[PDB]
Design a protein around this ligand. Structure first.
Ligand SMILES: [Cu+2]
Ligand SMILES: [Cu+2]
Ligand code: NA
Ligand code: NA
Ligand SMILES: [Xe]
Ligand SMILES: [Xe]
Ligand SMILES: [Xe]
Ligand SMILES: [Xe]
Ligand SMILES: [Xe]
Ligand SMILES: [Xe]
Ligand SMILES: [Xe]
Ligand SMILES: [Xe]
Ligand SMILES: [Xe]
Ligand SMILES: [Xe]
Ligand SMILES: [Xe]
Ligand SMILES: [Xe]
Ligand SMILES: [Xe]
Ligand SMILES: [Xe]
Lengths: 620, 620
């Protein structure tokens, strides 16, 4: 009954049937994206209309379509032909991944390059990589992937150990033609294997780890109703899943006494980009928008119990469309569990004689995805004390190259002859705020140092200042760790018992933002990544910081275009877009498989409550 | 047999006996500090000499002494009379805490102040607070505490809810005289109670939290031998305890194949300061050096199982001296346990067909202390992957004041009429480094942006730079979060298999440092707190960033004096001192008892190992 419920297999089959009936899904058509649309603002009192958005590709070369379907009513709402040279190519199809290697295997230029390096074509894997937009005019309006080669010595070998540097190829995956093969010269293909399950490399496995058993004999403290509505320790929300964004949180609210108080209307990772910092022409075009180009949700892992998620786990198994419109379940794709989180509050008071200790917990909602060599975990946390946090966990196998004789300013050495190009992993969290409702504003808060003098004779005073961001033109902000800069989202019409507007404070990690030159292609396509915080006025069609079609799409869409409207954001329905990322100079310890590294952000209540919200937590 | 073993009750009793026999511990003498000294550099092949350092106070007004005793040989090594006006007062004695209230209760000025506010003297608690060094010339050479008043309505009432603003008193705790009583005017004493165990305030306790059971059916994976030597998942160290610093880690090393490789020789929190930012004369002198003035180890809590430390816990019960030299055990004062830490490494490879997941764990060594209203947890973590981390957890009850009519730039409102002055909690971690041995150096590493142009035509390149800190004069460094600044400690004579010096990288949180005006008393006494990183050449007498005697001691000692020596630190025995802290603008959610907030730092291996050190971790 909830309009925020997960898409069911039946709904996807029905979208398929509606499209077929309407003449929009014949044998040459493929679904490159399909997702449920969120309900419009208002229309809660109105009857429900489940609508799905679909991007339809055509393998015969005809123009793709953007389509909206009402599965409730069995109708096509809208259908429009896309001009991809203008608005962008559709996301990469899973079926196109294999096409790069297959086509290159019978290309005379590719074969000549491999023969020069004494490499057997049957052993050469080709990573199918997004192309971006550079100086190649013939690529405009065409679906291109670029291929980098890695040798696989045998079926179970890790090809990443054996990059073939000095070689790159470009392929049109629709017309099935190799457009270009660039060979800048032979590099030695690194010879050491990177097989992290081979006993020769691991040595004898440790026998020293005794078991840790985490159980809940009475079950978990959270409830799941309507498939995806969670209630836990005063929190409530709906766990959505989208093939592009992955896990999406809807209607995050907190029950304070009798009142259900909204905090965040929608929380998602709306984009992530991995720009590479190696100026070699073999990789200088390399920027993976895993969300926008590849769709991270579609590659979500099935998570095994006791391995990926430990404890008393409740799973969701979201359904997505395959390329033909048939439903496909991602079995155990979302993990949900609560875990202990150390001490919540503690005081031993001399005067009263009262000793007091309470323990903390957090609700965890997560998924893990695999994009080629990369594996990312996306974790949302809700804490007893009102804190909301996101954490990304990056692991997998690092993307490799040759390590140049005489070293490199842009590549790390991992093993003899084996390099790892420098890169970043940068995320954009889109937080459609609803602090006590939709009438919100954002202030930038800095610490203020004070000069010793009149009114401050001992030179000890310090303070802070808040600046309201009143319009979108002044709401593109950078970090300032030195001055403890944070951003507070408040509701100017909702006051706490001390007559102060209720609010939440966003605490960033203040990691470096996009490092590329501001005149680069990537600085334009990932403009969002150049600044730490953006605030926009809510609009239903402003979904991603990079726009709807990122693949082979220049600047022109996304956040810079949204804020040009210069809309009022002082006590309005607003959206915060926070950029945060890891800058990775790979270390030898990252090879042959990388230990997890993390980045994230959190929001803490700031006069939202009238006192601590965890006074009613019981002892022990 | 280990020279790093915890002090035993017998050793402390023996120090007492040696001092007594030597004529240094008569009836008027009190021990203000006692701790074991670490073994000297070298002397490992030599027979052991357990030496203790003692600060002896005299209640009759005679000059205190600094004494070194050999408990092994039953001798006094050295004994010197201290001139406290020059070198500093001894740490506050626990017995002096109560003296402030007791003396004030019969003082006519104090009684007049309380009568003006209609407060019953029997209900007025006085916080005994360190005095610092300000403009009062008669305090020089005298042991002074300052008192701030809080009303306790009944025995179990939280006095912190009822601050008596506009009033402060100064007391000589040796001569037992009230030197000054300052009354700047009456403020309303806030009336609401802050009793967080009163059902009227908590409401009905939650019944929604189902149990979480964490057990280890085969016991823990770590071993404890010789009382305090820990071995866990290739790590080894000795867990010390000092009454000043609290838990100290010695000989942190990692067993890589057959070789035990040192990483850190000694790790401690060598100081912590809590400066207040309220310019009111009632509190503008307020700066608590909890480590240096109060001795945090001495107030370590006894930690209850299932409440303070959850899981399979192994406790240490460190012994300290009381004021007369008798041993006193802090029962269950140190917690040791291992815990699961999510995914360690994960990759699902298309080409090889191999799916791989490993789980992480960390060893946790912790204690919790209480200083008046404040409670701090100190946590050290060792991870499977070689990462070392420290985390401080701050909780307790916030220090309160009146909230001024018409607001304040330096105080937050918590409840009607109730204020919380702005302040910081700033820590100094002293890391006596031993990366593969004692020959170490530090480099500052910054990200380097590159300009689009020749050699970087697409404007994607980025790099980094390292600057060796060669001498102490150039080793006082600040954070730069924007450029991803870190510091690498390496051994220039120990190379990994890729011919690069082995190293560890320190990752700071880049929180603001000391905010006080540089000309203030606190900026001089806590000079260490004004900069993020210091590197010194190791010396046995350079123990604390504030020197040996912090109480009522001006600038002149500590880190600024150490680095003036301008010693070679490029491939030498060096010590890193990292400043890190929380800047606290109290929120309503902090009242009436504050949810934990955290700050810390970590160090990660940086080409220390020849490949990932966790390839031998078993599945599941
Ligand atoms: Cu990376
Ligand atoms: Cu604080
Ligand atoms: Na909003
Ligand atoms: Na050292
Ligand atoms: Xe079109
Ligand atoms: Xe929840
Ligand atoms: Xe879907
Ligand atoms: Xe579909
Ligand atoms: Xe791949
Ligand atoms: Xe969550
Ligand atoms: Xe990450
Ligand atoms: Xe003296
Ligand atoms: Xe350990
Ligand atoms: Xe001790
Ligand atoms: Xe003693
Ligand atoms: Xe106290
Ligand atoms: Xe530890
Ligand atoms: Xe803290």
């Amino acid at each position: 009954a909830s309009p925020f419920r997960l898409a069911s297999a039946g709904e996807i089959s029905e979208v398929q049937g509606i499209l077929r009936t309407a003449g929009l899904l014949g044998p040459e058509k493929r679904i490159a994206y399909l997702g449920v649309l969120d309900p419009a603002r208002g229309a809660g009192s109105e009857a429900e209309d489940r609508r799905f958005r679909v991007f339809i590709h055509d393998v015969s070369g005809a123009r793709p379509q953007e389509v909206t379907v009402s599965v409730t009513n069995g109708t096509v709402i809208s259908a429009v032909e896309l001009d991809t040279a203008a608005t962008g190519e559709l996301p990469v199809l899973e079926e196109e991944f294999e096409v790069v290697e297959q086509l290159l295997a019978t290309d005379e230029r590719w074969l000549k390059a491999l023969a020069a390096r004494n490499l057997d074509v049957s052993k050469v894997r080709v990573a199918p990589l997004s192309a971006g937009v550079f100086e190649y005019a013939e690529e405009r309006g065409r679906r291109i992937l670029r291929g980098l080669a890695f040798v696989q010595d045998f079926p179970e070998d890790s090809a990443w150990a054996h990059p073939v540097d000095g070689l790159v190829a470009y392929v049109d995956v629709v017309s099935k033609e190799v457009t270009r093969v660039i060979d800048t010269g032979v590099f030695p293909v690194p010879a050491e294997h990177g097989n992290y399950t081979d006993p020769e490399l691991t040595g004898p496995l440790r026998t020293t780890q005794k078991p840790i058993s985490i159980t809940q004999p009475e079950g978990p403290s959270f409830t799941v109703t309507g498939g995806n509505h969670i209630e836990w320790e005063k929190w409530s929300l709906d766990v959505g899943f989208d093939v592009r964004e992955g896990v999406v949180l809807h209607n995050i609210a907190f029950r304070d006494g009798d009142r259900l108080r909204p905090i965040i209307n929608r929380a998602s990772i709306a984009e992530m980009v991995v720009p590479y910092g190696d100026p070699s022409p073999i990789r200088s075009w390399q920027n993976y928008f895993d969300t926008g180009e590849y769709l991270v949700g579609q590659y979500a892992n099935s998570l095994e119990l006791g391995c990926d998620c430990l404890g008393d786990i409740t799973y969701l198994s979201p359904v997505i469309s395959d390329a033909f419109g048939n439903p496909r379940e991602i079995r155990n794709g979302i993990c949900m569990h609560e875990e202990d989180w150390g001490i919540l509050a503690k005081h031993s008071d001399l005067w009263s004689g009262i000793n007091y200790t309470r323990r903390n917990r957090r609700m965890v909602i997560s998924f893990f995805t695999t994009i080629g060599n990369y594996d990312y975990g996306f974790y949302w946390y809700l804490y007893l004390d009102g804190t909301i946090e996101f954490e990304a966990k990056a692991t997998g196998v690092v993307f490799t190259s040759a390590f140049p004789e005489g070293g490199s300013d842009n590549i790390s050495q991992l093993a003899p002859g084996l390099g790892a190009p420098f890169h970043q992993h940068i995320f954009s969290a889109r937080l459609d705020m609803a602090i006590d409702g939709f009438t919100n504003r954002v202030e930038e808060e800095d610490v203020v140092r004070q000069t010793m003098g009149p009114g401050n004779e001992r030179g000890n005073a310090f303070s802070r200042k808040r600046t309201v961001l009143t319009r979108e033109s002044e709401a593109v902000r950078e970090a300032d760790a030195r001055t403890g800069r944070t951003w507070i989202i408040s509701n100017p019409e909702s006051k706490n018992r001390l007559n102060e507007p209720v609010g939440y404070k966003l605490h960033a990690h203040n990691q470096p933002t996009l490092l590329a030159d501001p005149g680069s292609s990537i600085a334009r396509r990932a403009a969002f990544a150049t600044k730490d915080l953006w605030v926009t006025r809510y609009a239903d069609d402003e979904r991603y910081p990079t726009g709807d079609f990122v693949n082979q799409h220049s600047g022109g869409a996304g956040l810079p275009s949204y804020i040009a409207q210069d809309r009022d954001i002082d006590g309005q329905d607003i959206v915060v877009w926070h950029t945060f990322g890891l800058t990775h100079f790979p270390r030898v310890e990252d090879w042959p498989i990388m230990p997890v590294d993390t980045v994230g952000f959190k929001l803490r209540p700031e006069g939202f409550f009238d006192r601590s919200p965890v006074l009613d937590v019981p002892a022990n």
